[PDB]
Design a protein around this ligand. Structure first.
Ligand SMILES: *[C@@H]1O[C@H](CO)[C@@H](O[C@@H]2O[C@H](CO)[C@@H](O[C@@H]3O[C@H](CO)[C@@H](O)[C@H](O[C@H]4O[C@H](CO)[C@@H](O)[C@H](O)[C@@H]4O)[C@@H]3O)[C@H](O)[C@H]2NC(C)=O)[C@H](O)[C@H]1NC(C)=O
Ligand SMILES: *[C@@H]1O[C@H](CO)[C@@H](O[C@@H]2O[C@H](CO)[C@@H](O)[C@H](O)[C@H]2NC(C)=O)[C@H](O)[C@H]1NC(C)=O
Ligand SMILES: *[C@@H]1O[C@H](CO)[C@@H](O[C@@H]2O[C@H](CO)[C@@H](O)[C@H](O)[C@H]2NC(C)=O)[C@H](O)[C@H]1NC(C)=O
Ligand SMILES: *[C@@H]1O[C@H](CO)[C@@H](O[C@@H]2O[C@H](CO)[C@@H](O)[C@H](O)[C@H]2NC(C)=O)[C@H](O)[C@H]1NC(C)=O
Ligand SMILES: *[C@@H]1O[C@H](CO)[C@@H](O)[C@H](O)[C@H]1NC(C)=O
Ligand SMILES: *[C@@H]1O[C@H](CO)[C@@H](O)[C@H](O)[C@H]1NC(C)=O
Ligand SMILES: *[C@@H]1O[C@H](CO)[C@@H](O)[C@H](O)[C@H]1NC(C)=O
Ligand SMILES: *[C@@H]1O[C@H](CO)[C@@H](O)[C@H](O)[C@H]1NC(C)=O
Ligand SMILES: *[C@@H]1O[C@H](CO)[C@@H](O)[C@H](O)[C@H]1NC(C)=O
Length: 378
């Protein structure tokens, strides 16, 4: 039976910033001194003959070792305790996901649980929905270590569009009778797009006339999600507003175009799509042309016989003019024909043809007119 000093409790787990009572007791017949050694501030104090009690408050530091001591028979009696603070996982943070992520690519989940301790008792979990992607236990870390970090690389799936990812931190104090403390990050939603290497198909005529209405179509396939893809069509400058319809992962853009005197000649039909951050484009060179209709004119529509009539077919400054089988003489300017009205010329038709070359293409516009020979006696 040696005389001893005792400090209670020996091991203590207090939440950071918290407080606890420490009791020092001794069996020595009379103490010549007594007290408790700590850096911590105290609030309440209690005492007895063989014992002494302090309430230690506002304990921030991960590790502090108090020593309760007594002096009995000119000998120093000692007891050494241990006080360990713990912090709940108040901050659990998942790193921002890529705004758009490629399907078949990899992205990295990063969870961060600052300050939570002790680290050794921490278990971090990365989740996709209710499923656990990875589970990490920190057992074996230093006793004074606070905070934890878990990172994993996940493969993006078409399955994964609109899926929620979260991080889950778990502090296990159960051996100390303090149970479990857990908190989760706000879920992060994942966007997965898939864009095939192919440029969009653009269906257009190579030749377009000013004022004419022709169908134009742009299309693509293998687009996920097809709904989020934004397709732009236009002829040169002017923007077409096609009807974009979605069949499976394929889109179909259908529109109509009229040349405004923008162009004529060399122009581009552009179709560009954006899905995610990626963009595709297809350009078609298109020729526009102005082909003014040939003007067929009679000196008079109605004439008596013997009266002189001049029929002419005039065109724009461009084409080759053919009147009644006779090419314009000379070429490039209106062709004229003259005749004296006969009774046989009543209900007689005249014809003018304009032949224009555009990009090697031969284009014709035919026109007709009818002459009336007024009836009378001779
Ligand atoms: C529709 O019309 C447009 C023009 O309105 C037209 O675009 C042209 O495309 C050709 C190629 O198809 C371009 O030619 C290039 O010209 C550059 C100089 O600017 C050259 O250096 C390029 O040469 C490359 O390839 C060579 C081997 O073939 C290499 O030797 C060289 O190092 C380069 O790698 C290239 O030939 C031309 O510039 C444009 N025109 C304009 C005005 O931008 C387009 O082709 C038409 N579409 C169709 C289907 O015909
Ligand atoms: C701390 O000191 C000792 C720890 O054992 C306590 O001393 C005894 O406390 C019990 C409580 O039921 C009493 O029955 C005994 O008579 C006490 N013994 C003596 C010699 O005092 C003491 O009570 C504790 N003090 C506090 C505030 O917890
Ligand atoms: C669980 O963790 C979340 C995420 O860290 C905590 O929510 C945050 O709370 C603090 C302020 O108290 C701020 O960072 C934000 O207001 C929250 N961040 C968000 C919403 O992303 C939350 O406090 C924790 N829950 C607990 C304590 O159990
Ligand atoms: C899709 O086509 C449009 C046509 O307007 C492009 O818009 C312009 O493109 C020119 C030529 O490259 C650029 O110099 C301009 O900055 C663009 N202007 C405007 C107002 O958009 C557009 O760039 C194309 N889309 C993509 C992704 O390139
Ligand atoms: C200790 O005393 C302070 C005032 O100095 C008081 O505000 C606080 O409540 C006390 N701490 C406790 C009871 O843990
Ligand atoms: C997934 O991520 C791992 C880790 O970087 C990498 O080794 C692997 O190539 C990725 N899978 C792909 C790119 O399909
Ligand atoms: C993802 O989480 C949000 C809440 O943040 C929820 O509204 C949504 O339904 C979830 N998405 C799926 C597909 O579970
Ligand atoms: C028609 O009659 C007029 C007047 O006599 C004459 O000048 C002309 O040569 C005749 N022939 C034609 C085709 O005009
Ligand atoms: C000439 O005009 C007629 C009727 O206006 C039209 O039906 C025909 O297609 C034209 N001829 C040619 C060769 O296009």
């Amino acid at each position: 039976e040696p005389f001893w000093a005792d400090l209670q409790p020996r091991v203590a787990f207090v939440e950071r910033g918290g407080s606890l009572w420490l009791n020092c007791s001794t069996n020595c017949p009379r103490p010549e001194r007594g007290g408790l050694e700590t850096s911590l501030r105290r609030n309440g104090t209690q005492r007895g003959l063989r014992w002494l009690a302090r309430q230690l408050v506002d304990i921030r530091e991960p590790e502090t070792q108090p020593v309760c001591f007594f002096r009995c028979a000119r000998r120093t009696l000692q007891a050494r305790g241990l006080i360990r603070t713990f912090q709940r996982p108040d901050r659990v943070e998942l790193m921002p996901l890529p705004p758009w992520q490629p399907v078949g690519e990899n992205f990295t989940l990063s969870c961060r649980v600052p300050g939570a301790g002790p680290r050794a008792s921490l278990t971090l979990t990365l989740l996709r929905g209710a499923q656990e992607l990875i589970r990490r236990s920190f057992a074996g870390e230093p006793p004074r270590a606070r905070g934890a970090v878990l990172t994993a690389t996940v493969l993006a799936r078409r399955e994964d569009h609109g899926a929620n990812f979260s991080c889950r931190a778990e502090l296990d104090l159960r051996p100390h009778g303090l149970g479990l403390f857990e908190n989760s990050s706000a879920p992060r939603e994942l966007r997965t797009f898939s864009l095939s290497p192919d440029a969009p198909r653009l269906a257009a005529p190579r030749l377009l006339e000013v004022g004419s209405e022709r169908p134009v179509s742009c299309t693509l396939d293998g687009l996920f999600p097809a709904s989020e893809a934004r397709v732009y069509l236009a002829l040169g400058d002017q923007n077409l507003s096609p009807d974009v319809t979605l069949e499976g992962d394929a889109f179909v853009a259908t529109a109509t175009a009229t040349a405004s005197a923008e162009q004529e000649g060399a122009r581009q039909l552009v179709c560009n799509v954006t899905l995610g951050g990626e963009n595709r484009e297809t350009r078609e060179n298109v020729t526009i042309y102005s082909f003014p209709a040939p003007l067929l004119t009679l000196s008079e529509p109605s004439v008596s016989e013997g009266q002189m009539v001049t029929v002419t077919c005039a065109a724009g400054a461009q084409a080759l003019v053919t009147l009644e089988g006779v090419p314009a003489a000379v070429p490039g300017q209106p062709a004229q024909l003259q005749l004296n009205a006969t009774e046989n010329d009543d209900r007689r038709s005249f014809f003018c043809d304009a032949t224009l070359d555009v990009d090697g293409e031969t284009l014709i516009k035919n026109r007709s007119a009818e002459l009336r020979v007024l009836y009378a006696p001779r």
